[model samples]
Target: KKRQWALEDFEIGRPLGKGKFGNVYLAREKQSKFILALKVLFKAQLEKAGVEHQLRREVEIQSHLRHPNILRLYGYFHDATRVYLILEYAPLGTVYRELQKLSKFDEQRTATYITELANALSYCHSKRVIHRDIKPENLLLGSAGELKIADFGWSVHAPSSRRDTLCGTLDYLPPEMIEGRMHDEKVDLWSLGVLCYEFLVGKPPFEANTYQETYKRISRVEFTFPDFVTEGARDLISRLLKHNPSQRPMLREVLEHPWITANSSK
Candidate 1:
């Protein structure tokens, strides 16, 4: 940016959130009087991780995105010791926290979020941006009930997913990735499927007594719907959670499915 940023330029408020490397603060730009979340990651930790290339890529990718479902990375600047990211503030925090309070979401609400993300994911894929991590913790909600995908740190910043940098959480990992096969945008679809199940059921489809058990279940894409899940929801989840990426429906089909169409009109 043409203008250099300093701590004096923003009145930092209470902590907005925390992550592996740093904490985010609620802040407002002094000049423009704009509200935003300022993410501060330690320079030492980032250097120690040897991920400068990844961080730069993350900045490039996130700043270019324009979808409402994708959180905006306004821009970034750094002092000698720390990196600062200016981000759009999502007042409601993470959906994971909200879900933890309610245990799970009602089916219609779940479908609504899914339908919205289908459009977002469709755009992400079109841009060659694969969101490897699509779990609830990486999803935040706006005050207007809009969902924003958070944390581009992995999909853009991590090493390639050739076992050396397997980024996604295990429960949502697709068989292709879990089996050490080369992957692409389709991995996000697999994650979207797992996300849909978790949205309705409160836990991932492959949740089990042990991590190994979970991996086994995920390898087979195994899941069974509870009696409370409507048939339309069940059918949609079934098709999405297929082991073969080819078997999974495209976002277009998913958005047009009877369940999504039925809920979207309401």
Candidate 2:
């Protein structure tokens, strides 16, 4: 069993970033001299949002899952007013911030990221964990340029079954989700397709000026690739983003796709 930690056991440094209900801070463990990220959540806001139960579920699932590309939560502690979760810090920060700085990613970088995430997602699928939300903001880069899936608030563990929930970001939602059809793990594959397009183009494939336009584009599965996008990449995206989930490529196919395997190791 892990040692029960107290607030004083960590040497808190600068604030890393703000999250949905709180802020993440860079901190060092006093005894081990190990650096980690501390996610501090406000109890009042959680209560107001009625998401304390959601937090419990998130903790339950993540605590048991061990994946190289998924962020790890060391442990959690809470006081009357707040909760703190100790997590492995991703030194390079988020892919969303990186994309904003670079405007867009080249094919090589996109492929490396996609390939790394593909293996991670496959492992998660094997464990029956469906990461309902997969977006650039939720993806963090490690110092070794490894991509880690950082957020699991919208995930669920579905073993040999389907789930019905209107969770996840609007932009990454699949057609099945939009139509309120019963969905299984393929939802993540759909999000992966949207992510791949966004990585190469710096914007989601179905993005539009207004919510109605975006919704319409998503529902109709309307998207066009840029002239710069390679045929292999386009083929991969088309295969993964099929309106029918049953038609999407398997996870093994994603890692082995020509577009994904062509990249140099990061």
Candidate 3:
């Protein structure tokens, strides 16, 4: 039999999370007893947002990716009114929750997170997929507390290595994107810097009083390391946060950084 799914085939449980388009629910496959997170999106909402194409691209990209650190898109289905995306269930939920509870992560934990993300980003880059949006809200924790990249709404498969679209959160935008210059996968590298900083400092590096000021700060690449952050960690963050994308270290180099190597448990 072909692999197909429908609402009738699942035993829906409690709500896992809510979104503007729809809600995700804990579901169990009736036939296989497999637990999964069922993401439901209303067609009307998708139409109104004019993001049906983005949704399709996300499905195409995420469904093909096979990595322990990247959340799995098992399959999908649709009814006349809504679309369903079957996702791997991560019990620990978004890393944003943990970050809030702890205020900020210790160096060891931040390094570990950076290490895992570097490995995963390396894998994605190998497949020509650029995850333009890499932030705490998009990360999930698996059963074993392993980090997983959960959202791919802004991801793109850029074999040409050139992209002009300015997408993703403002706080994580690189200088190239802020300046409206042509960019490539290195956008993710800049995001990694912002992520790394946020992980240790409890907030993004370019936070400002207003949107205009924040844009100015990002364009200038003006940020300072908190006094509490270690020098080794600062070195890695600086390397990734360079104004020139080419100047940024590759994910491979990120994993090799002394800070990461020392902090990573394994």
Q: Write the per-residue lDDT of candidate 1 for residues 139-243, one digit (tens) a residue.
A: 889888888997876673222455545544578788887788777777777888788888878888888877778779988777888888789988888888878
* Comparing 1 and 2 on TM-score, the stronger one: 2
Quote each prediction's TM-score.
Answer: 0.93, 0.94, 0.94
Model 3 lDDT on a 0 to 1 scale: 0.87
Ranking by TM-score: 3, 2, 1
1 or 2, greater by lDDT: 2
Task: List ranges where model 1 is wrong by over 4 Å.
Answer: 156-163
Model 3 vs truth, CA RMSD: 1.9
Q: Over the stretch 1-266, how does candidate 2's per-residue lDDT look in tens digits?
A: 36777788899988876876689999999989999999999889888878887787777777777877889888888878789888889999999999999989998999888888888889888988888789999998888979999778778776323444454446898887777666778988999999999999999998887766777888889999989998998999999888888999888888888778887363
lDDT of 3 at 201: 97
Estimate the Cα RMSD of every predicted model relative to the unseen true structure. Answer: 2.3, 1.9, 1.9
Which of the two, 1 or 3, has more lDDT?
Answer: 3
Q: CA lDDT of 90 in candidate 1?
A: 93
How many steric overlaps does candidate 3 have?
Answer: 0
Least well predicted 10-residue stretch by lDDT in candidate 2: 159-168
